[PDB]
Amino acid sequence: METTQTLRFKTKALAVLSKCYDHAQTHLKGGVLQVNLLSVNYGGPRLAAVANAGTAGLISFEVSPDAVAEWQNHQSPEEAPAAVSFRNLAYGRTCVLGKELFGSAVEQASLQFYKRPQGGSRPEFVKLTMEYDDKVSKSHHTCALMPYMPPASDRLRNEQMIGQVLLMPKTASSLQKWARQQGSGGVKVTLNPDLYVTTYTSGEACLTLDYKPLSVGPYEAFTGPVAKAQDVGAVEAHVVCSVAADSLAAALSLCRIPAVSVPILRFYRSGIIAVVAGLLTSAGDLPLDLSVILFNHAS
Amino acid sequence: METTQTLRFKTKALAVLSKCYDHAQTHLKGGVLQVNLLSVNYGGPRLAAVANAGTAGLISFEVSPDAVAEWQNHQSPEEAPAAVSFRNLAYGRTCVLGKELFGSAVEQASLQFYKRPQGGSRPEFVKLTMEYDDKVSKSHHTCALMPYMPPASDRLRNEQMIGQVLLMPKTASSLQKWARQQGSGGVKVTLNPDLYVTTYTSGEACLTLDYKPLSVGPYEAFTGPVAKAQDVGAVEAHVVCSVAADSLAAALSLCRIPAVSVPILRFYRSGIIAVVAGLLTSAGDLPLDLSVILFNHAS
Ligand SMILES: [Cl-]
Ligand SMILES: [Cl-]
DSSP, X not given: OEEEEEEEEOTTTGGGGHHHHHHHHHHHTTSEEEEEOTTTTTTOOEEEEEEEOSSSEEEEEEEOGGGEEEEEEOSOTTTSOSEEEEESBOSSOSOBHHHHHTOTXXXXXXXXXXXXXXXXXXXXXXXXXXXXXXXXXXEEEEEEOOSOOOOSTTTTTTOXXXXXXXXXXXXXXXXXXXXXXXXXXXXXXEEETTTTEEEEEETTEEEEEEOEEOSSOGGGSSOSOBSSOOOEEEEOSOEEEEEEHHHHHHHHHHTXXXXXXXXXXXXXXXXXXXXXXXXXXXXXXXXXXXXXXXXXOOO | OEEXXXXXXXXXXXXXXXXXXXXXXXXXXXXXXXXXXXXXXXXSOEEEEEEEOSSSEEEEEEEOGGGEEEEEEOSOTTTSOSEEEEESBOTTOXXXXXXXXXXXXXXXXXXXXXXXXXXXXXXXXXXXEEEETTSSOEEEEEEEOOSOOOOSTTTTSSOOEEEXXXXXXXXXXXXXXXXXXXXXXXXXXXXXXXXTEEEEEETTEEEEEEOEEOSSOGGGSSOSOBSSOOOEEEEOSOEEEEEEHHHHHHHHHHHOOTTTEEEEEEEETTTEEEEEEEEBSSSOOOOEEEEEEEOOOOO
């Protein structure tokens, strides 16, 4: 058995995300764990819990490379994949890997991808192992990788961000509730730079949220921790997005992590939207990049 | 690291218990997993999930020795302990070991015990391993054992059984509901050979259950599967037992596993009751000895 790649995290790195994972736990359960190698020499490897949200949404519970302690790709650059991924809910078992992985009592978490010496050009298995606080307890999980998929966190690299608005906790819940009220319907999201307003409509139903302008462009907004939670926004263009009410509801929920993050809506020139979890200055330097992509939903 | 004991179960042996465990998982979760070494010259090692039920009850989900494929004790009889135990809910972990151990897809299950070559009469750690159907997935859990405890399935060795009555579904359920209604009070259970009836009182509340006599003593009854389910009993002496209503309710619930078992109440001369899960001929030959001991409880 040969090792294709080795990935190991720093002491207790992933444990600080324990509560964050718990918040997203229910949505991440039926998804998959995925390590993005496609960005190894672009910051480092990126492990992420990836799953669906609603009728047209993709969650990416991603860990910043800052959490990585050692990376090793033993395959020729040309053989290694852009990404490997196994399913979060391990084969047969009752244990959800993401839960154990992002556990708070884990000192060292690490992954090892293997293949059989003979036939097979790409990794075929992964071996997660978590070593706990007690300096005594270990857990090793051997799983089969899945049919290759691109890095979830790769679908927006060529997209153009025309603005993003921070949603104050109450506003977020308010929207999140409205979205839920719309069931399996669609929501037409409207960004109006002129009116400093974001609008959502689903049939006759409707909802309007105002926002204070930031005398700065999209890409220069919310670059660091969110020091204040207020309905603020940096928009530089109009746009209408057709998303699924249910996906929007799940996103707003997941990105508002108690005492940790507040939802930030990122608008793209194409009809696409990405609800991002803006980290509060309080919740320290969590190596988290949580987002949910709202795909185009034909109503 | 020195290996003291090794236990390997037969292929798929513990998987047949999958639904049975699930039926008790809520109770077993906070208990412990434990291997009774005493029963090695009495059929073989006995693994059991052991936990508390109500205010005065001990639950024992024991696996018949005929499920074990290979046992090896590498310690002299002097050093070897009577029983080894470790938390069912693994340390800092999120999965309960028992849930994964009795997984329906576990091809092979095995346990190993170790200790350091210094200070330590008995084993200090255990390593459970699960090999799955897919012939690819494996799980290894390494834990610390707990301060030693006697084999749960031993507390009834000197006790002399004076009677046992089987309860059919509708009957058991009446008793269980009655017990839950008595909330946190105590139940005075009476066995009357002259009136062929068992009575339950908790304050002004009461309940009487008739049973048809078996022309055989206590120890020769319900030896094998129970092809039918009718309120019959092989009693042979009066006895009044003081039990906790909540333990009684839990015990009846646990021993009536849907389409698998029916509760059987075993009364002992000492006024102690043990609720047992009589297996229906319907269920196959499950290697399961589930029971719940109702200890003495005062008003
Ligand atoms: Cl209970
Ligand atoms: Cl010792």
